[PDB]
Structures are given as C-alpha cells and as structure tokens.
Design a protein around this nucleic acid. Structure first.
Ligand code: NA
Ligand code: NA
Length: 327
DNA sequence: CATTAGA
DNA sequence: TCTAATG
C-alpha cells in the first residue's frame, strides 16, 4: 500500500504504456501481475534479485527495478513521458468514443489535438462526435446538489408514463456521495422478468419521455435494454446554464433488481466484501442473483428477493444503508 | 462481461 | 460477422 509505492507505481506506468501505445497485451499483462505481487508483498523491496524471487517478477522487470531503486527515475518511463506520439494517444482517449485503437489511427492520420478533431469532425462517428461536442462538460463532476434535481426530474417522468415503473439511481449518489460522474438509473417493471420475453417499448417508452420533456438531449446508444445518452437541467431563469451530463438507463427483470441493484450501489469493495460474505453463509452473489451453495463444489437455484433486505437476511447480514456501503 | 455501433 | 468502447 505504500512501502511498495514507487515500485508499484512505475510498474503500472509502464504497464499502461504497453497496452495503450503499443498493442503489447503480453507485456502489458506482464507488468500488471508484477505490479500486483509486490503490492501484496510485505517487505521493503530492496533490489533486483529481491524482487526477482517472485512469481511474475522476472529479469525484465527486475532490471528496471534497480535503476529505479538507484535513480529516482527510469528512462523508458521518461521518454514515453516525453514522446508527443505517445502523449498524443493518452490525450485522444479522453473522448467518449475514443479509444486506443482509434487514438492510434487518429494519430497517424495526424489528428493529435482536440482541435484536430474538430477539423475532421467527419472522420469521427456520432459517439465521439458527441464525445467531442460536450468534451468539457464530461470531465466535470456531478454536484449532489444537482444530482437530486435531476433525480427528481427523472422519477418524474418514469412515474408519469406508468406508475408501475420502478427506477433507481444507483451508485455513489446513492452512497450519500458529494458528487458523481454520470447518473445511473436502474430500471425495471413488473410485467418484465426472467422469462416474460421482453417489452422493448418498456425502455423506449421512458427514453422517449425524457426526450419529450427535454432532459435527454442526445442518444449515444439505445439498445433494447441499455441506453446511454446525455442530459441537462433546464437552465433556469437565464444567466446560468447547466453543464451537459452523461446518463445511462437500463431495463431489468423485476426478478433481479435488488440484486443488480445491491451491486451497482457498490461500493466496489462492500460487494467483494459482501460477495465474500455469502460464500461462507452458503451462497453466491453476482449482478443479478443469490444462489444457495451446494457442497459438490457448485450448485444452482436462485433465491427470491423483494428488497435489499432478503440478501442480507439470506447470507444473514445487518442491513446496511447505502450510506454505509463504504467498503 | 455484457451490451451497442459499425462497417 | 467482428471488433471497439462504454460501463
Ligand atoms: Na520469481
Ligand atoms: Na474515451
């Protein structure tokens, strides 16, 4: 967690550089584990060989290690830090719809600046275009203050169309969190579950609604289960407009909300940690279900949930507020 | 890791 | 189809 700081840190640098700049999945994959072992490692690593002794830690890494152990730097790390070509990529990627593969190509054609992108708005697809459009706005964090207005508004339509709907903004916003990235409203409806072969309009109905009232302004992808778009709080009585937000809404089988619901509300840990709990409490939890564990190794038979409650009740926990889903 | 664009 | 990007 700290003793191994600089090592682990450089390692991930390196690592990331591989994947991104180069199409070096192996190396890339290499550093990570390397980076991973030593993290877990209990002592203050002192040198190449010292590391060396570990699974994953080979010669290559080791070497770089010492030099780092020697100079508070590393070369390759430095060069890459320098190289526009590589820095160029790390930049492009910031655009929704822009990835490494694109970032690289985009570069070879020479696009390297956000401005470059404008100039070749055509060379980009509706995603990235939208990605590019609201570029500034996407980087900004979401105020909880805002978070609720929005929240309010969304629920406002959901119910409006049909009362039978149930939608939930999951995440951090949900964990009391001061700010969010993008909001996630986990959708579902009674008439829809594990079997009742869809009702696509189920989604479509909503999306439409929000578009109607002007909350969603753009679509990034509408599927018949997941939608990804961009929204905005009606910019009040002139003088101050809202930034453009990323939103995501998804349909769910009322027979898996809570589950899927427990899950997204995390935290990323509370989950592993809650997930870690059900294993010993004779269960299994994953994004949609709770399965009673059978001694053969595995088992099946997904247990019937009506609130975030049952799950705790099942594996037998203390119901914990979203507030307290901290770790 | 599953869902949507694309091409 | 496959592959990329998002989550
Ligand atoms: Na070793
Ligand atoms: Na991106």
């Amino acid at each position: 967690e700290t003793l191994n700081g600089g090592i682990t840190d450089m390692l991930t640098e390196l690592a990331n550089f591989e994947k991104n700049v180069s199409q070096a999945i192996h190396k890339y994959n290499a550093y990570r584990k390397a980076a991973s072992v030593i993290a877990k490692y209990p002592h203050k690593i002192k040198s190449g060989a010292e590391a060396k002794k570990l699974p994953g830690v080979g010669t290559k890494i080791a070497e770089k290690i010492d030099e780092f152990l020697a100079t508070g730097k590393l070369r390759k790390l430095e060069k890459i830090r320098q190289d526009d070509t590589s820095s160029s990529i790390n930049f492009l990627t910031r655009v929704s719809g822009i990835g490494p593969s694109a970032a690289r190509k985009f570069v070879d054609e020479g696009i390297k600046t956000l401005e470059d992108l404008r100039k070749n708005e055509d060379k980009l697809n509706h995603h990235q275009r939208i990605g590019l459009k609201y570029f500034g706005d996407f980087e900004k964090r979401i105020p909880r203050e805002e978070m609720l207005q929005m929240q309010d508004i969304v629920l406002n339509e959901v119910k409006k169309v049909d009362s039978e709907y149930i939608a939930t903004v999951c995440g951090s916003f949900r964990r009391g969190a001061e700010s969010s990235g993008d909001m996630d409203v986990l959708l579902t409806h009674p008439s829809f579950t594990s079997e009742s072969t869809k009702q696509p309009k189920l989604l479509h109905q909503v999306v439409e609604q929000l578009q109607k009232v002007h909350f969603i302004t753009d679509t990034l992808s509408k599927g018949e289960t997941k939608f990804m778009g961009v929204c905005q709080l009606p910019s009040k009585n002139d003088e101050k407009e809202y930034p453009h937000r990323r939103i995501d809404i998804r349909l769910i089988p009322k027979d898996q909300y809570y589950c899927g619901v427990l899950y997204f509300t995390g935290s990323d840990i509370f989950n592993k940690n809650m997930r870690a709990h059900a294993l010993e409490k004779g269960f299994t939890i994953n994004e949609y279900t709770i399965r009673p564990l059978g001694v053969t190794g595995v088992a099946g038979e997904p247990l019937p949930v009506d609130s975030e409650k049952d799950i705790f009740d099942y594996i037998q926990w203390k119901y914990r507020e979203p507030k307290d889903r901290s770790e």
